[PDB]
């Protein structure tokens, strides 16, 4: 038997009980950094390193603007659940 | 930016 | 180190 | 072996659900920039070898009506099946244009004893949403 | 800047909402299995790596034992969560 | 430039907390099986090169004080940190010998902004506990 | 077998 709960993976965008950031020009910081690491890697790196590259990208390269002094200068890290039993490979 |  | 598919 | 067999007739099914307009009773916005998000992950996962669809605006109701439906096909000849939410959100919780819905009873339909053909097969599910209301003020 | 959540690593024996299965004379599954890969790839597999092979041997080597027919014949597979923005390894 | 920085003079500290007896009050029964455990897990990460220290039967303002001060100390020549948690459990907290505390406040000690001298270094906690009263029963 |  297999468990029924296994080989799910969950890439969510920020971590339990904050907020998500996302730019009404360029799109939403997660989905900028996800697509930007698959557009280079995502046919030659394993999964966790795909979303790992995505989680460091992420937290790096954003920082919210905002006139409000109260949600100006904010950062942001996504978070990666997995239940997966096996490395993922897009290709060969 | 906005919050999702 | 090398992780190769 | 330590990889998922990748050998199959097709990668798979990836389903979008671009979430931009709300019910006013919901106190949700436009979440302006969303159909941006849609069409890079459409184009970028088309790439990869992904059949896509893309959902918008869509109900509670239609969320899990949708995903309930794709878990009744055939994944005989997948490799694995992907999922992507965009919307706004609470902890544990999605918005569909008229409330919200557990993210749990979504992927629950795709659970081993709920659909066979995926079974021992990797189910992704990415998701860009709020998850609360704390801000990360940052360090250094 | 850097997000005050990252870097943060979470390997859960269980997934949420469910038990996590102990055996009284050789210990819980996850522990038996964490030590065991480490024992053996411990310093030549990434973190991410060790951990999906864990929990594919939770997953697939473990089977509960019981009289009550309630908790006959169950499974476990374990949750890894991670806000790492690098791949992380044990040497060098 | 991939790959966390391990040149430091020392791997990291290793706490392990093995919880076996509960009070009465508590209604815990006793975990066997988990010396068993303990004492693997300490062999391992020692292995590793943890300095590792195991702590039995701890309360929960025991365990909170333990990570708290271990979070003050000065890990400036430790590549990162570890803590494993042995014990009963429900969703979001962990049992100590005379009740519960949230996981979130035993982790939060090392958030980036409490702990300068691990920012950027991995945080490592390991968890044997129940998360709910949810069996699974597997399938073919 | 025991729970946690």
């Given at each position: ?92 | 930016?906005?919050?999702? | ?5 | ?91 544990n919780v999605i ?7 557990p993210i749990k009873?979504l992927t ?33």
């Amino acid at each position: 038997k297999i468990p029924v709960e296994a080989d799910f993976l969950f890439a969510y965008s920020t971590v339990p009980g904050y907020y998500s950031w996302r730019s009404p020009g360029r799109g939403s910081w997660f989905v900028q950094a996800l697509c930007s690491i698959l557009e280079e890697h995502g046919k030659d790196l394993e999964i966790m390193q795909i979303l790992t590259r995505v989680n460091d990208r992420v937290a790096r390269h954003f920082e919210s603007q905002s006139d409000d002094p109260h949600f100006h200068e904010k950062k942001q890290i996504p978070c990666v659940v997995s239940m997966l039993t096996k490395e993922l490979y897009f290709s060969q | 930016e906005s919050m999702x | 180190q090398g992780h190769g598919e | 072996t330590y990889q998922y067999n990748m050998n199959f007739e097709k990668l798979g099914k990836c389903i979008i659900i671009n979430n931009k307009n709300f019910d006013k009773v919901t106190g949700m916005g436009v979440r302006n920039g969303t159909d941006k998000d849609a069409e890079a992950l459409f184009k970028c996962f088309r790439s990869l070898g992904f059949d896509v669809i893309v959902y918008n605006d869509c109900s509670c109701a239609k969320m899990q009506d949708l995903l309930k439906k794709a878990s009744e096909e055939d994944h005989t000849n997948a490799a694995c099946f992907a999922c992507i939410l965009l919307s706004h959100g609470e902890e544990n919780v999605i918005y569909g244009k008229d409330g919200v819905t557990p993210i749990k009873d979504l992927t629950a339909h795709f659970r081993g004893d709920r659909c066979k053909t995926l079974l021992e097969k990797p189910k992704l599910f990415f998701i860009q949403a709020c998850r609360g209301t704390e801000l990360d003020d940052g360090i250094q």
